[PDB]
Amino acid sequence: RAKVAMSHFEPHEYIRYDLLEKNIDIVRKRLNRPLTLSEKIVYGHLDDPANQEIERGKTYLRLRPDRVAMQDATAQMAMLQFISSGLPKVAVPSTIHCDHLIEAQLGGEKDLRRAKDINQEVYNFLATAGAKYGVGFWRPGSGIIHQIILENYAYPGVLLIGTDSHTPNGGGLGGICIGVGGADAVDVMAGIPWELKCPKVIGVKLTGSLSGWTSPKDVILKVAGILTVKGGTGAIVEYHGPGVDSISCTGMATICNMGAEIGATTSVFPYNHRMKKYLSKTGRADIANLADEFKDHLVPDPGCHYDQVIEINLSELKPHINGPFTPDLAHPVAEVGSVAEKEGWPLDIRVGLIGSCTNSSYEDMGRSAAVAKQALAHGLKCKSQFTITPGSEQIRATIERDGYAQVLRDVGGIVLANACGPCIGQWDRKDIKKGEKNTIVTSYNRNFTGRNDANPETHAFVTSPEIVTALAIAGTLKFNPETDFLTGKDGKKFKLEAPDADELPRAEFDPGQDTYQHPPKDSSGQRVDVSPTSQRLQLLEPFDKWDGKDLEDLQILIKVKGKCTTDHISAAGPWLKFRGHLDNISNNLLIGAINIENRKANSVRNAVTQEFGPVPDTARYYKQHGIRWVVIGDENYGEGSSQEHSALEPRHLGGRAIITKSFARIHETNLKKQGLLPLTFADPADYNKIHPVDKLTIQGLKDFAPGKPLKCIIKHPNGTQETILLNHTFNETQIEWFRAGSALNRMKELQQK
Ligand code: SF4
The answer to whether the CB of 420 is under 6 A from ligand 1 is yes
Distance (Å, whole) CA 502 – CA 480: 24
Cβ contact 383:272 at 8 Å: no
Distance (Å, whole) CA 300 – CA 297: 8
Cβ contact 422:452 at 8 Å: yes
The answer to whether the CB of 423 is under 6 A from ligand 1 is yes
Distance (Å, whole) CA 508 – CA 236: 33
Distance (Å, whole) CA 519 – CA 568: 37
Distance (Å, whole) CA 582 – CA 648: 8
The answer to whether the CB of 177 is under 6 A from ligand 1 is no
The answer to whether the CB of 357 is under 6 A from ligand 1 is yes
Distance (Å, whole) CA 417 – CA 391: 9
Bridge pairing between strands 721-727 and 439-442: unpaired
Ligand 1 pocket mutation, candidates 99, 353, 356, criterion most atoms within 8 A of CB: 356
Ligand 1 pocket mutation, candidates 169, 258, 358, 418, criterion most atoms within 8 A of CB: 358
Distance (Å, whole) CA 3 – CA 360: 33
Query: Which residues are CB-contacts of 138 (< 8 A; sequence separation ≥ 6)?
Result: 95, 96, 97, 98, 148, 515, 516, 517
Distance in Å, CA 357 to ligand 1 centroid: 6
Nearest to 419 by CA among 70, 100, 116, 165: 100
The answer to whether the CB of 127 is under 6 A from ligand 1 is no
The answer to whether the CB of 164 is under 6 A from ligand 1 is yes
Break sites following residues in the chain (C–N > 2.5 A): none
Distance in Å, CA 232 to ligand 1 centroid: 20
Cβ contact 176:155 at 8 Å: no
How many other CB atoms are found less than 10 A from the CB of residue 544? 11
Q: Which residues of 120-144 are buried (b: 16+ CB within 10 A; e: fewer)?
A: eebbebbbbbbbbbbbbbbbbbbbb
The number of angstroms, rounded, from the C-alpha of 412 to the middle of its chain's C-alpha atoms is 31
- Superfamily of the domain at 533-753: Aconitase, domain 4 (3.20.19.10)
Distance in Å, CA 309 to ligand 1 centroid: 29
Say if residue 748 is exposed, middle or buried (CB neighbours under 10 Å; 0-12, 13-18, 19+).
middle
- Name the phi and psi angles at 463, rounded to 5: -135, -150
The answer to whether the CB of 424 is under 6 A from ligand 1 is yes
The answer to whether the CB of 360 is under 6 A from ligand 1 is no
First to last CA, the chain: 42
| Helix boundaries (H) for 502-655 | 566-569, 582-585, 615-624, 645-652
Distance (Å, whole) CA 681 – CA 704: 16
Distance in Å, CA 72 to ligand 1 centroid: 12
Ligand 1 atom at minimum distance from 355 CA: 3
Residue nearest to atom 8 of ligand 1 (CA): 357
Distance (Å, whole) CA 713 – CA 722: 6
Distance in Å, CA 149 to ligand 1 centroid: 13
Cβ contact 59:53 at 8 Å: yes
Cβ contact 296:326 at 8 Å: no
How many other CB atoms are found less than 10 A from the CB of residue 534? 15
How many other CB atoms are found less than 10 A from the CB of residue 608? 12
The number of angstroms, rounded, from the C-alpha of 506 to the middle of its chain's C-alpha atoms is 32
Q: State the number of CA atoms in the 13 A half-sphere of 470 facing the CB.
A: 29
Distance (Å, whole) CA 393 – CA 419: 10
Residue type, 33: R
Nearest to 81 by CA among 171, 162, 189, 201: 189
Residue type, 635: E
Distance (Å, whole) CA 231 – CA 219: 16
Distance in Å, CA 3 to ligand 1 centroid: 34
Resolution of the determined structure in angstroms stands at 2.5
Residue nearest to atom 4 of ligand 1 (CA): 420
Enter the DSSP assignment of 587: G
Give whole-number Cα distances, 144 to 47, 138, 342, 348, 460, in Å.
Answer: 31, 10, 37, 30, 21
Nearest to 361 by CA among 209, 466, 452: 466
The answer to whether the CB of 358 is under 6 A from ligand 1 is yes
Distance (Å, whole) CA 371 – CA 389: 17
Instruction: Give the sign of the dihedral formed by CA 122, CA 125, CA 126, CA 127.
Output: positive
Distance in Å, CA 544 to ligand 1 centroid: 34
Distance in Å, CA 7 to ligand 1 centroid: 23
Distance (Å, whole) CA 159 – CA 152: 15
Report how this structure was experimentally obtained: X-ray
DSSP lists the bridge partners of residue 96 as 70, 137
| Helix boundaries (H) for 52-178 | 72-85, 108-118, 120-133, 145-152
Nearest to 415 by CA among 391, 439, 440: 391
Distance (Å, whole) CA 538 – CA 191: 25
Nearest to 279 by CA among 288, 292, 271: 288
Q: Which residues of 29-66 are buried (b: 16+ CB within 10 A; e: fewer)?
A: eeeeeebbbbbbbbbbbbeebeebebeeeeebbbbbbb
Q: Which DSSP helix (H) or strand (E) runs through 420?
A: none
Residue nearest to atom 6 of ligand 1 (CA): 166
Query: Which residues are CB-contacts of 29 (< 8 A; sequence separation ≥ 6)?
Result: none
How many other CB atoms are found less than 10 A from the CB of residue 88? 9
Query: Which residues are CB-contacts of 273 (< 8 A; sequence separation ≥ 6)?
Result: 245
Distance in Å, CA 424 to ligand 1 centroid: 6
Query: Which residues are CB-contacts of 683 (< 8 A; sequence separation ≥ 6)?
Result: 724, 725
Residue nearest to atom 1 of ligand 1 (CA): 424
CATH number listed for the domain at residues 202-314 = 3.40.1060.10
Angle at 358 between CA 336 and CA 566, to 5 degrees: 85
Nearest to 275 by CA among 303, 295, 296, 297: 295
Residues across the chain: 753
Distance (Å, whole) CA 255 – CA 588: 32
The answer to whether the CB of 101 is under 6 A from ligand 1 is no
The answer to whether the CB of 576 is under 6 A from ligand 1 is no
Say if residue 20 is exposed, middle or buried (CB neighbours under 10 Å; 0-12, 13-18, 19+).
buried
Cis ω for the linkage preceding 324 (within 30 of 0) = yes
Distance (Å, whole) CA 14 – CA 4: 6
Q: Which DSSP helix (H) or strand (E) runs through 552?
A: strand 551-559
Query: Which residues are CB-contacts of 179 (< 8 A; sequence separation ≥ 6)?
Result: 161, 162, 163, 164, 165, 166, 167, 168, 260, 266, 642, 666
Nearest to 555 by CA among 486, 604, 519: 604
Say if residue 529 is exposed, middle or buried (CB neighbours under 10 Å; 0-12, 13-18, 19+).
exposed
Distance (Å, whole) CA 678 – CA 692: 19
Distance (Å, whole) CA 69 – CA 633: 31
- Name the phi and psi angles at 724, rounded to 5: -125, 160
Cβ contact 349:137 at 8 Å: no
Q: Which residues of 467-494 are buried (b: 16+ CB within 10 A; e: fewer)?
A: bbbbbbbbbbbbbbbbebebeeeeeeee
Give whole-number Cα distances, 371 to 212, 484, 487, 549, 622, in Å.
Answer: 12, 14, 15, 65, 57
The answer to whether the CB of 451 is under 6 A from ligand 1 is no
Specify the 3-state DSSP secondary structure of 263: coil
Distance in Å, CA 688 to ligand 1 centroid: 37
Distance in Å, CA 257 to ligand 1 centroid: 10
Enter the DSSP assignment of 181: -
Cβ contact 594:560 at 8 Å: yes
Nearest to 349 by CA among 455, 416, 446, 431: 431
Distance (Å, whole) CA 165 – CA 266: 9
Cβ contact 250:167 at 8 Å: no
Specify the 3-state DSSP secondary structure of 183: helix
Distance (Å, whole) CA 742 – CA 753: 16
Bridge pairing between strands 194-197 and 60-63: antiparallel
Residue type, 411: V
Specify the 3-state DSSP secondary structure of 67: strand
Cβ contact 405:354 at 8 Å: no
Distance (Å, whole) CA 137 – CA 90: 13
Nearest to 247 by CA among 293, 304, 204: 204
Distance (Å, whole) CA 613 – CA 304: 55
Distance (Å, whole) CA 300 – CA 249: 18
Enter the DSSP assignment of 44: T
Domains 202-314 and 315-489 share a fold: no
Architecture of domain 315-489: 2-Layer Sandwich (3.30)
DSSP lists the bridge partners of residue 320 as 332
Ligand 1 atom at minimum distance from 145 CA: 5
Distance (Å, whole) CA 400 – CA 90: 37
Enter the DSSP assignment of 432: S
Domain residue ranges in the chain:
1-201, 202-314, 315-489, 533-753
Concatenate the DSSP letters of all residues of 352-376 into one string.
Answer: EEEESTTS-SHHHHHHHHHHHHHHH
Specify the 3-state DSSP secondary structure of 600: coil
Distance (Å, whole) CA 517 – CA 130: 9
CATH classification (class only), 1-201:
alpha beta
